Every structure is written in structure tokens, then in C-alpha cells.
Amino acid sequence: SVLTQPASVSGSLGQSVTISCTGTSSDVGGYDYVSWYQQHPGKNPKLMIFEVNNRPSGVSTRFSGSKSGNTASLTISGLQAEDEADYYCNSYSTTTTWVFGGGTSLTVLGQPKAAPSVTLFPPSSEELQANKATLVCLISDFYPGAVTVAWKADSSPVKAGVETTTPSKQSNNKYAASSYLSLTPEQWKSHRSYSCQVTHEGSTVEKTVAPT
Amino acid sequence: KPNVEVWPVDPPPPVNFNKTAEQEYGDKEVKLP
Amino acid sequence: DIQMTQSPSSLSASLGDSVTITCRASQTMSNFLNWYQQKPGKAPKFLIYAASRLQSGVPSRFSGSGSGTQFTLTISNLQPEDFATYYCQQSFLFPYTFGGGTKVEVERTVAAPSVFIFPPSDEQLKSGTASVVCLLNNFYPREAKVQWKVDGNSQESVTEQDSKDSTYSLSSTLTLSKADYEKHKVYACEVTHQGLSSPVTKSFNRGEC
Amino acid sequence: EVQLVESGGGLVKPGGSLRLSCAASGFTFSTYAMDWVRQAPGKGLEWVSLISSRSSNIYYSDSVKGNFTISRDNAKNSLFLQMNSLRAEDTAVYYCAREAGGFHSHFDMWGQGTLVTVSSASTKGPSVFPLAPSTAALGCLVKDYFPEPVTVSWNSGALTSGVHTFPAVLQSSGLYSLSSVVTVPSSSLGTQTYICNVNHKPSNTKVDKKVEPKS
Amino acid sequence: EVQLVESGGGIVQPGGSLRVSCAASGFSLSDHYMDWVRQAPGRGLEWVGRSRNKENSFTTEFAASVRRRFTISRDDSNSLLHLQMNNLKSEDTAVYFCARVGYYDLWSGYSGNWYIDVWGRGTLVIVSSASTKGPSVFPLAPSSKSTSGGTAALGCLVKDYFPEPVTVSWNSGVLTSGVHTFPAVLQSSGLYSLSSVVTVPSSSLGTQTYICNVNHKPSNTKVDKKVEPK
Amino acid sequence: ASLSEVKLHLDIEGHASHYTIPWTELMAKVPGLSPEALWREANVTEDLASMLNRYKLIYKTSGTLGIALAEPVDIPAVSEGSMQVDASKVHPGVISGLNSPACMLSAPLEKQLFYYIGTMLPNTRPHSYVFYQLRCHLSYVALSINGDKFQYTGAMTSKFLMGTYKRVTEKGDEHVLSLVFGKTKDLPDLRGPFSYPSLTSAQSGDYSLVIVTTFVHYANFHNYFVPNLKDMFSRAVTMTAASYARYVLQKLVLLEMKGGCREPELDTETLTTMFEVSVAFFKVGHAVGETGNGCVDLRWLAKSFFELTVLKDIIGICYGATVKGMQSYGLERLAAMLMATVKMEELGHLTTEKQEYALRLATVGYPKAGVYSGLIGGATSVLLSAYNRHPLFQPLHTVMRETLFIGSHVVLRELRLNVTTQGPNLALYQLLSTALCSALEIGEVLRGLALGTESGLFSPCYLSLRFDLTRDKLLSMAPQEATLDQAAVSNAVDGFLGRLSLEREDRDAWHLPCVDRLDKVLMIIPLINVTFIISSDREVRGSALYEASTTYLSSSLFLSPVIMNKCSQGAVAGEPRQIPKIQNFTRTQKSCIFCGFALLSYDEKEGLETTTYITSQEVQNSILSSNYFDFDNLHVHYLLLTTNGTVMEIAGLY
Amino acid sequence: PCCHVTQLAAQHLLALENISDIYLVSNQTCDGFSLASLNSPKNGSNQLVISRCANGLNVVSFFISILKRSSSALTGHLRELLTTLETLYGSFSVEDLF
Ligand SMILES: *[C@@H]1O[C@H](CO)[C@@H](O)[C@H](O)[C@H]1NC(C)=O
Ligand SMILES: *[C@@H]1O[C@H](CO)[C@@H](O)[C@H](O)[C@H]1NC(C)=O
Ligand SMILES: *[C@@H]1O[C@H](CO)[C@@H](O)[C@H](O)[C@H]1NC(C)=O
Ligand SMILES: *[C@@H]1O[C@H](CO)[C@@H](O)[C@H](O)[C@H]1NC(C)=O
Known about the structure:
Bound molecules: 2-acetamido-2-deoxy-beta-D-glucopyranose
CATH architecture of one domain in chain A: Sandwich
Distance between the termini of chain E: 59 Å
Structural class of chain E: mainly beta
Strand order of the largest sheet of chain A: 3-2-6-7
Number of strands of chain E: 18
Radius of gyration of chain A: 24 Å
Order of helices and strands of chain A: EEEEEEEEEEEEEEE
CATH class of one domain in chain A: Mainly Beta
Distance between the termini of chain A: 60 Å
Strand content of chain E: 35-45%
CATH superfamily of the largest domain in chain E: Immunoglobulins
Order of helices and strands of chain E: EEEEEEEEEEEEEEEEEE
Structural class of chain A: mainly beta
Shape of chain A: elongated
Chain A: 769C2 Fab Light chain
PDB class: immune system/viral protein
Helix content of chain E: under 10%
Assembly: heptameric
Number of domains of chain E: 2
CATH superfamily of one domain in chain A: Immunoglobulins
Keywords: Antibody, Fab, immune system, gH/gL, Epstein-Barr virus, herpesvirus, IMMUNE SYSTEM-VIRAL PROTEIN complex
Radius of gyration of chain E: 24 Å
Oligomer: heteroheptamer
Entry title: Crystal structure of Epstein-Barr virus glycoprotein gH/gL/gp42-peptide in complex with human neutralizing antibodies 769B10 and 769C2
Shape of chain E: elongated
């Protein structure tokens, strides 16, 4: 059993989002003991609002709540630093003794300058055995983290092997990705050029490697 | 002479088959002395 | 919770005497009073439960009665094996307690004490302390009041009944620092005893020889 | 220090056993009660066993099988979560939560988390290939390993400054592959050396390669 | 015959922890209450605690002055009974006795119809913060003013000794008539100091030589102090 | 701002669980309680000093005597074929007769046994500190003896019972001690820091007995009240309802026997009996209550409620107690209706079990004496039908004694009436009991007045008309050499006269038996149309006067009739007529021409010996054809009393 | 020591109508004391903190005697409540107070 939270809610720099949460009458509408926890992607969550409009030590005056009937609505007030983490909900349920919400994702809409940084490496100089030399193309520091990567590599892309990570944001509040062109044979025994092309909202950002 | 037998008695009086159940006891309250 | 008050504190009786030991209860505890005897150096011995009933083996000399507030214990034809201390105990309510204890001892005629002082040896004055001991020897009864002429800081101890002559002995010890001894010069022993119509004193001062 | 980090366990066969030991330090262990909270890799956040103070009242969730045996003892400050059979391949990131105590029903402290993958595929040892520096950019690749976690420690002690580690890729073969990059001053690369000291705990295999510049 | 041999006593610093033990043989330890009674040196008895009966499922109860500190543990298959002592104060210095409790009019219930018939040999618990120290013997001089009708009664003063027991003699035990060895008295300094006296004629002052033998095993100290008049 | 809802925050260490309880919702679902009455009853804001001062005040036992008692199967299984009768809906068509199985439902019966409702647990000094105020449907038994200076009030619900001893002594201190009995799972609610294990005295697997009083009240009560709680709790659990009631009924008669009900010495057994009277009423109502809407067998109800009726009727004479409740009108009317389905005069013809079962309904159906006097005809028929089938002069049987005792109450209750309409049947009953009191009868009873359980309870000598039962003559019929437990011999003889309190009054109404010689009557023998008064003197205003050869030492033996119960205007003038001797009688007879007569044999040294009422032919056959007549012993005469007022002496047979 | 049971000041009143959110405490928390604090519904900020400390052993026995007298309408939420109050009432130091 979980509390029904909105899937994904978005807001801009201001007083844009006060995310909600609801549950059973014996879970939230029965006790003033709901709580909120913020979790950044791939890190330990920490208490963000304990009870209802009762904040812990070390929390700005923007995080608040709502004392509705059976719906607890976390209130991040009228100023927005870029905190694009997942917000969760929980309360002391008489039936389940602890019940957690679904989990949402607030996305801030500001500072649009991203300009991803690309770095492309030759196949590993140490490794020389057959069927073992793969390319590595790295992309970091972009936003909103919706990029399309491709490998032209000649007059026309052969696209034999293409495997790309989903953009996973981390420290500095900008996303990062990785795409490994996993194909040594069938092309790279002898050829002219090879390129890792990156497209972010429309851009010719590319890297070219085929040395020696 | 006839053997000794019990003297005849009167038939039983017809008791109330139809009372109130409130008058056979009285008030439902009571106080311990 | 209930307090026991025994009487008397001390008791003296020779062989064949008839003694009675009173045990006063705090509040009303009907017949829930037991008696025990304890000889000096041994464990207590069960004597009486329910304030009138005796444990199997206790001789017929022992007998006690009383109920409620007042309880007693009476001995007839006092035997030498009875010379010990007796206690009464209440078993009615929690927390349970015992009595102050009544000490029965052999009696005799009065005996005048032998009182004399012991100035502290110069072996102690070189250490930093001083000890003046007043001594009483072979006196009866145990009740005797010795008192250094303060006009506290003193201690004493008494010996048990000497089985040879039924007498006692007392040694009151006074300890004063060396700096004080030099010119205090009072140092007396006021010995008051019922066997002394005139209290004998042993006055002294810090004077050599 | 109020560090509350679990020792944890690696991957396990469906029909297997594991004893997650949540080691906690700093605070008073006997005053609070302990918890376990697990997170599915996608978005889930489910609740697990509830061991109380001095082991007086033990609670469990409904989704947890009820045959997940938790226990603890405050003499040696730790928290064992003994799982048995776990043949359900429903894994999660088992965090170690801390109950606020008093009258508050909230979590005041949390743990680092433990990744326990459950699949029918054996482990695969990683093969680290060194990348080339060829103004300032380095690299180090980890290829053909299964499963996570594989955290890249950079030069044991190269402080995290430019040390950036990209997430693993979902390879069609099932194995994972990650790569790490460090930005060292290109003014002088040969004055001092660098290595990527990465270890694979679920496979127990350490391999170290160095970075050597262009010719 | 019923024996209640007990042990476990010893010297404990204030605030420490000590465990006593009382063994039973001659009855069923489960079907009888077991209480504890201590007695301070020179003072009277004091009821300490109680372990209930088998019918009562072995629950404990203590007096108001020792309740929150002590603990009673009962071992039955093997006859044993312990009274663990925690946070000992200076007032717990007493002779703790092991006591067996039995009820007479049992058909009337458990109200007050009990007694204490068998007493243990008694264990000693001394709560002090001192340590082993050799006694400093001081001779009490037979002053020339000690006529006393023809008796001098010289003595020796054992001063400032902590190790509990000491024995004394005069002339290696030759002189025993008139010997009055007084009991020890715990001074304010925490160290006992007793005194021994033996009566001797006054006309023998100068002819006979009297020496006290302060034999002491605890601190392995033996002194032979000669007494001379002032 | 009414009583709506409160939250209960529990600090389970580390967890901090929460609970909620709404007053508005459940105060109407299960009414009968008000939280604000209990809130301003528990001293929520009591300081720690006042709570401990209250804790040290109530006496607390030093333990709990644990004894595992098993309980019996009191209420039997429902006889397949019985008719379930509603206690509140009873009409004459529900039952067919005595030989028809039946059982009354338990739910309407409980509402009739506990119709009265009141505050059980008071707010007195010892009670207001332990329990909470409880008010349930109760049935209490209350009495007071020493001018209201000693009170007892045992109140009970359908699951637990509480008795309360209250004695006020001289200056005004009222020492109050109470006992509670019932299942440990249904004991009343405890208030404050009090727990039950520190207060219960005896605790079984499911039942417990609690004692609630102060240390000062318990101490003063411990002097004269040292009860045997061991056997008390054992019999209050292991015994059934009827067996426990008859057990208390026996010990109550023993108190009435020697002193007791006239001067109650505040003994240990005296107060022990008062509590067990309330337990006897409790176990009956408790066994019925422990049935889950089933039905209680009617034969078991008649067997248990007969004991309560006699128990209530014996305390109304002994202590004048008051019993409210435990009297279901449905049972009183179902048993009263069952009297028209049988014939009173022909009641003795039924089976022995049906005889005892019909007499239990005779007392339960008409508890109030006077509603139907014709019930004497049934009890007289049982005694008459038992005399013809009983070996002459032999002591009675446990079964027969129980059969006649179980119907003797309808005779005793009618004897307490000032005027009675069933005169002849009362004289017929007293005549048979007089003919039943043989020398062997008062020999087994005197033997049974030390060992036997049933013997001392009932005997037809108590209802007899013999008046020669002095302490000297009763000592001449001991069971043995009189050395076998010698003390019990003199105590039993002195007690037999103690059980002659039949018509010892507190209203002056024993004018139910015309002579001027009261304390010298030897026997009264009422036949048809003549009643003979045997006496030891001449002054009896009768229609004749006979004198038999008396002894050798002056104690004359007279007997004189009164024709048609109409005494003459003056005493006789001349010498009283001598009884004539007759020898012309055929020992082998063909008809009961002796029926209705009275055959009496008397000795010349120990006075009278026997009395034999000739009832039928089977009785006369066992008189003549037996060795009853012994003429070789010349000093054993046989005086025959006729219905014509004539008196003869049989001297020979052919 | 967590709080203190005070003598009733003459001008202080208590009515079961305005009281809500009662706090019971375990023994280990307050040296073995049974301390209960009586509060009201949170009416915001009107200067008022009506925290009313009371004798826990009397409060616990009151809620035990008010759930047993209404056991017919005792739901699962209250069945657990009655059992937890019983175990908490018996795990206290009734006698152990000096
Ligand atoms: C409640 O408190 C008052 C305060 O003095 C006290 O007198 C009263 O006796 C207490 N209630 C009970 C039942 O003891
Ligand atoms: C009894 O009474 C009636 C007169 O009332 C009479 O006719 C009857 O025969 C009498 N019987 C005897 C035996 O006297
Ligand atoms: C309770 O609340 C009402 C207002 O709704 C107020 O009039 C009354 O005085 C209050 N009583 C207490 C004791 O707080
Ligand atoms: C405290 O509670 C524990 C159990 O939680 C119990 O064993 C103990 O008796 C209680 N009292 C004290 C003084 O620890």
C-alpha cells in the first residue's frame, strides 16, 4: 500500500510548485504525523519537512505544508533554487505502521544555457587482441538532459552498434551521458574517419577520431 | 375396611398465565443496604 | 513501614530469674509478631511465631503472649544457654522490620572501676598526632559515663561480659593534633559511675614528667 | 560523526541467503529504534522490518514476506537484516533508516544504501582499459562487468576535483560498462603519474592501470 | 538437618558491584520463600529482600533503602541463590544472612502467617574506599600515677589500621590474666584503631619486662613494641 | 465542544505509536457509561504523594495461593426431544406433563434472574480507592444481626460476586472487609496503581478470589475471622450448583441447631457460612449465564432452584435476610402449571424419581406459603405411599430420606401459618411421621449426627408428635458403647432437641397441633374422628380416660380420646377405666378390619417403644404374620387404639 | 523527572471536552515514572500551551477501564490499543517508588 502522489510536476523560479499527497482517512486525515523526504538521484534522502509546516534545523523558509482534510500538500514557497530532486510522502498508518508515497519529480525551468561538453577517446592503446577495442564518447554538463547521439563515421552512418546511457544529472545540477560505440570488427581494421555526433536542441557539436 | 388414603384436596388455583413481568418484580432500580 | 520498639534496652538477671521482654508495635498488627534469639558470634535462632506458638525443639521455659499493639516474651528458670540478644519481628505488612533488640546478661553486685590515664608516648608526638586513653577495668554494670573535660572529638569501646567475673572494661580514646597538644593543658577524665559516690577525675597538662 | 552506513551484501541467486548488517555510530543506539527502507531501481520506496529499542516489538510490512528475519544487539553497534530464500527477483536499494524517537513518527536520519541484485546470471569480472590523454582530459574505462556497484576510486586519493564518473550503459548483452574522466593540469603531465584504482566488490577483483600521454 | 552455607563476601569500593551466594541442602528450595537479612556491626537486624515461592513464580521484593539497587537470582535444578549487589554505598557494610521462610497456616493464604526458621552462616560485605595498610603500633606507657591500689595495667595502642582483623598477645602469650583486648572502632579517617590492656602489679614495675606482640596476617605485619614508663 | 474524540499517543520506546478513540461513536453503540463520570473518578491530576498514601492504605497479601481446580459439568446436555420454553412467553400449552422433556432458554431466563439493576461497587472508604463505580444488573443477599452493628451484603452479576462484611464496633469505627469471587477474566475494573495478583488470595486456572480491605480493618478482623480459604475456594469451584447449595444448607442447619440463629457468636465458621450463602446463589446464576444462548434443562433447574428457595426461606427465619433477584417468574409459573398435570392424592403412585422431581416443583411453583394449601396432599401421599412399602421400624434410606425431605418443606411452610385449611392432611402427615420415629430411627440419626452427611439433615421425628424425647431417654439409645468418640454422643443428643425448633417462633403462632397438663404429654395420636392424647396425668378434658399398668416406680401412663375433636366441659369424676385384655383374634386374617386403627407397644421400664399406624392390608400382614407380638416378655404390652375411641390390649393370637 | 504531578491550584480547571492528544510515556524514559501530559487541539498561536501533566497510572487505568467496559464495539484498532495499555500498565514500578 502506497500514497497516491502526482507523477511529475514542473515549476519555474518563483512560488511555482506546492506538491501534494493524499492517502487513507486513517493514514493522513487521522493524524498530524505526515512527513516529507527529498532524495537526489543516487544519494541518501534526508528529512525535508517533519510533521506538517514543522521544519528541522538547517532548512530555508520556503519548505512548508498544508493542513487539509486528508491531503498533505508540501509547500515550496515563492523562491526556487535549482532543486531537481524526487519528493516523497509518508505518514504513520494505523494499518501499515509506515506507508510511503509514490514519488514525484519537480523540475525547475530556468537558466537554459547548457552547451554540452563532449570528449572522445581513441580505442584503448593497451589492448590489442582481436575483437577487443571499443570506442568511448563522453558527454557531460547539459540541460534539460534530452540529447540525441549518433555516429556518422563516414558518408552515411552504418549504425552497427550504438548503446547510450540515459541522461543522469548529478552535482552542478546539469545532466551527463555516455555512448560507447561497441564495434571493433567489421569496420575498424582499415578506414579513413570516424565521428561521434551530439545533438542538443540543434547543434553541430561533434568529435572526429581515426588516428594512425 | 378400606385402606388408608389421603384426604381429598381442592384443585390448584389458576395462576396468571398473562401477567406484566413488571409487577411480579416492581421497579427495575434497587439500592444495596 | 511499621516500627518496632523493644524494652528495655539492657537487662540483667542471674540463673533462675524470670525475665520479660516487651515489644511495642507502631500500629495494630494482630498477633503477626515473631521472636528470634541470636548469640554473639552466631546466626539468629527461631524461637516463636504468631506471638504465642513455639517452634518444635524450643524448651518450655520460653513463652510469650500479647496481641495487637503490645507483645511480650517471658523466660522462666533462666538457663546459662539463654544469655544472648533477642529480637521481635513483624510479618504483617511490607516492608517487614525487626526490633531494636534486648540484651540479657548475667547480673552481680556493683563494682568500682579502676581508672587511670596514659599520656601519649613521645613516639607518637614525633609523627604529628597524639592519643590520650582513659581506661576503666572490671566494673559493673555496663552503664558508665566517662567524659573528657571538654570545658566531643572522642571515641570509646566496651568489652563484652567477662565470663569469669561478669564485669566489663572501657577505653575512651581522645585524638588531638600535635600543634593543639602543646598548650591545651586541661586533659581530665570525668568518670561517673553508680559505684562511685564521688566522681574521680584524672587531670593532667602538657608538663614534662 | 553521525555516520549510519550499512556493510551490505552483493548479488545473490534467487534461492539464496544474505545478512545485511547496518552499522551505526555516533549517537546513542539504545535510545532510538531502527528501521529498513528499500528502493526499487526505478522509483519505488517500500518499507521493511521495524526492530524497536532493546528488541521489544518487531514489526513487518505486508509486501515483505514476513520471512525476512531482523535482529540486533546494542552491545556491538550494528543492525543485522537476515534475508532468507529471497527467490523473488524483486530487488531494491536497502537503506537503513532511523526512527526519530520520542513521540515523532518520522525519520530523522538515513543511511547510504545497499545494492542487492538478484538474477540468474553469474558474475563477470571487469576488464579495465586505460584511455589516452590526447588540452586537459584523461580517461579510464571499465568494460564487461556484472553486476553493479562498481565505484571508481581515482588515484586512491586524488581529491574529487574534476574526477567525474559517468553512469553505466545498458548493454544488450546484459553486462554493464562505465567510464571515468579526470581533468589534470595539462601544463605538465609527466611531472607526476595517475592511476584509476577501481574495485568490484560483487566480484572481488581489483585491477589498476596508469595514464600515459601521447607521443 | 538443613544447611544454608553461604559465601561470596569480600571488600568492595563504594559504588562497586558484589555478588553473594547461598547454597541449600535438606529441602526443596522451590517450595519455600527465601529472604535476606543484614546486620550492621554492633547494630540490629534489617530486612533486605525476598524471593517468592514456586506457587508465586519467583518474584522479588526489597526494602525501601535497597530496592532500586539489588537483584535476586534463583538457580533451582542445582540448589543456588544469589543476591547481586549494585551501586554499593557505605551503609551496606553489614553481615548479610541467608534466611529460609515458611508459612504455618497455609490454608488461610499468604498474608502474614510466615516466619524464618533456618538462618545461614552469614556473609560479610565491607564497603570502604581504603586499602591494605600496616598498623602503626604505639605503646601506652605505664605512667607512675597508675597506682590503682597496686596495679599498673600497661597497654599498647594499635592506631590507624584498615585491614579488618588483628590479634594481639603479651610476652608471646605468656601473660593472659587481666588481658582486656577492646574491640575495634572505625575512626573518622576510615581506619580502625583498637587497644589492648593487661593488668600487672605496681610493685613489679622495673623487675618484669612486658612486651606486646601485635601479630597481623592481612598486611603480613608483626611488631614487638616494648613499653616503658614516662 | 462535546465529548467527541481524543488521541492516545503511546511512547513505545523508539517507535511512538498512535491511537484514536472517539467518544461520540461508541458512547451510543454500547451505552451505559459516561466517560466524564470516570474521568472525575480516577484523580487524573493526583500527585504522587496522594497516590502512594492511598496505595499503602489498602492491605495487600504477601502472595497468592495457587491451586488448579477443575470445574464440573453442571448443566447437562439438552435431551433430544425437549421443548424450548421462553421464560417471558409461557402458556399452559408449552408443556404436556412431568414425563415430557423440557428446557428453558438461557437468554430470557437471565433477564429474569437479574431483572433488578443497581450500583454494585459503592464509593465507601475501602472500595472507592480500588475499584471503579460499576452499575450492572445484580442480585444481592443482605442481612444484619447485632442491631445493624454487623452487616453483610453479597452482590453478584452473571459473572462475578462480591460480599462485604461491615461491623461497626462501639465507638463508631466501621471495619469493612470484602471478598470477590468469579472468573479472573471478568473481575471488575481496577483503579489507580492497584493490580490483581497482589490482591488475589487464591487463583485457579480460570477463577480467582480477591480480598479488598485496609491493613487496620484486616488486622482487627484477623482476630476472630481466620477462614480456610483453601477449602473455601476448592468447594466453590469443584462442586456443582445443587451439591454446593445443599452443602451450605447443611451447615446453616447446624448453626440453627446449637445457638446460632438466636445468638450469633461472631465465629470464623459463622462469617464463612454467610459468604457461602451468596456463593450458593451465585453458582446457580453463574452456570446459567455461562451458556451461549442455549437452554437449561428443566430437571436441573428444579434441582437447583429448590435449594435456593429453601436457602432463602431458612435465612428469613434465622437472620431475616433479604434476597432480591434470582427468582424467574417464568419458572415459578411453569412449575406451578405443572401441578394441574398431576393428581395430588395419587402423587405417591409415581416413580421414585418422578416423586422427588414433582416435589421440587411443588416448592418452586408455590414458594409463598398459602397460595395453594393442597400441596400437602401430595407430600402426604408420598409419605403414605412410602410407609406401606417401608420395612416397619427400620431407618430410612438416603433416597427415601431425600424423597421425604424434599417434600417436607411444603409441610413446614404450612405449619408456619396461623390458620390452615388442610387440617386433616396435616394430622395425617404428623401421624405417619410419628409412627416412623422408631427407636432404630433415633439410633441411626444420633449415629448420623456425627458422621453421616444426610442422616442429620432430615428425620420424621422432627415432624412427629412424640413428647417423651428427654435428654435422659435419648441417651438410652446410643449407637455403640458410647466410648467411640464419646464427646460426640452427648453433643448429638443435646443437638437433637436443638433441631426441635419446629414452631419455635418470632411471632407467637404455634397454635396448630384442650388439655390442662401441657408439659406432661407423652404422645398425641390423631385418627379419624378421634385423637388420642397419651399423657402421664389425669387432667385431660377427654371423652374417656384409660390407665395402663405403668412401671413399678411412680410414673403413670394415661391416654384419653376426644370424640370428633370436641372436648367435654369437665374432667372425669370416677376411677379411670382399666384397659381390657383380649385374646380372641385370628393371627391369620382375610380383611383389614384393623385398618384405620393405631397399634402401639410400650415397655414398663423405658416408657414407650413404638407406634404403628395400620394403613393397608400389606401393613397388617407384616404385623400379625411377623414376630412383632412377643408375649413371653410380660412387661411388654401392646395397646390397640380404635376409631370408636375404644382402647384394647392384645394379649394373644391364634 | 520528565514532568511533575502538581497539587491542583484552586483556579485551574480540567474538562474532558476541550482535551485532545494525550501523551503516555514509557518507564525507561522517565526513571520509572508513569507521567501523562494532557493537551488540547492545536488552535494556532493564542499564547496558550495547556500542557497539563497528570498521574499516568490513573490515566492508563482509566483508558483500560473504558475500553473493557465497551468491548463489544472494540475494533481492531482498539483491540491492539487495549492490549498495549495492559502491557504498559503492568510493566511499571507500582511499588518501586521510594
Ligand atoms: C484526589 O486528590 C485529592 C487531593 O487532596 C485527595 O484528597 C483525594 O483523596 C484524591 N482522591 C482519592 C480517591 O484518593
Ligand atoms: C366419622 O364422621 C362421620 C360424622 O361426621 C361419621 O358418619 C363416620 O361414620 C365417622 N367414622 C368413624 C369411624 O367414627
Ligand atoms: C472549554 O472551551 C470553551 C469554548 O469552546 C470555553 O468556554 C471553556 O471555558 C473551556 N474550558 C476549559 C476548562 O478550557
Ligand atoms: C521498565 O520496563 C521494563 C520493560 O520495558 C521492566 O522490565 C522494568 O520492570 C521496568 N522498570 C524499571 C525500573 O526498569
